[PDB]
């Protein structure tokens, strides 16, 4: 980018690469149900490991896994996003066998269903906000006060 004269902030590339490092491979199950060589999210294995550590069990031995954007995209938890990306047959078959549940965490799933995306004005942070004028606010406050 610098070579071609394009000014671009590192943070974006960092976002992508962050999605590339999302996965890990098990080097030993310990006390878990996981299998040696099994691949899963770093998050879920950290959760499983803190749950096993809090339980006094042996944590899972894992190794960092670096994958490219295509594989990382196809490897996500949401089957709607994956199936809509590409290799639809594979994604669909594997997901259907596993009886997978898409939790609609991302944008693409909600876009498929035509729901309100969990971003911007649809973010659960800002979407429940209310607006009331002082006249109405006091009119309700009096009803609250009389009871």
């Amino acid at each position: 980018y610098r070579a071609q004269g394009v000014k671009l902030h590192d943070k974006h590339i960092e976002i992508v690469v962050r999605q590339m490092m999302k996965y890990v491979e098990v080097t030993d199950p310990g006390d878990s149900r996981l299998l040696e060589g099994q691949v899963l999210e770093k998050w879920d294995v950290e959760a499983l490991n803190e749950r096993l550590i809090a339980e006094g069990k042996t944590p899972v031995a894992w190794k960092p896994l670096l994958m490219g954007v295509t594989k990382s995209a196809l490897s996500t938890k949401s089957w709607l996003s994956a199936a809509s990306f590409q290799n639809t047959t594979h994604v669909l078959t594997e997901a259907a066998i596993a009886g997978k549940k898409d939790e609609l965490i991302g944008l693409k799933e909600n876009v498929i269903l035509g729901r309100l995306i969990p971003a911007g004005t649809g973010s659960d942070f800002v979407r429940f906000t209310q607006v009331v004028d002082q006249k109405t606010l006091k009119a309700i406050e009096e009803a609250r006060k009389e009871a």
Binding site: F128, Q130, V131, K135
Partner: protein, 94 residues
């Protein structure tokens, strides 16, 4: 740009919350025939017709202009929804 947009962004912790507040308020004004406005008759947004100045039909314009006056309260869980609805239907019949 929208007049006083910097101040509006200044009011909120997330720009999207500003958008939500403005839209909801505009819906309130639309539903109630503007009867609930916090704007004095001089502060009323005006459209220029062939005849002359009339009330600005745009509820969003009204919403932002109201919001600028600080006469509105925004936030999360200020009141049960149905309560707000019915109290506003009482005060301002539509």
């Amino acid at each position: 740009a929208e007049p006083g947009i910097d101040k509006l962004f200044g009011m909120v912790d997330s720009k999207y919350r500003l958008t939500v507040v403005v839209a909801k308020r505009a819906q309130q004004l639309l539903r109630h025939g503007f009867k609930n406005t916090v704007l004095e008759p001089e502060e009323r947004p005006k459209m220029q017709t062939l005849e002359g100045l009339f009330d600005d039909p745009n509820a969003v314009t009204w919403a932002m202009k109201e919001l600028l006056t600080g006469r509105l309260v925004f936030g999360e869980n200020l009141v049960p929804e149905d309560r707000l609805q019915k109290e506003m239907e009482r005060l301002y019949p539509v």
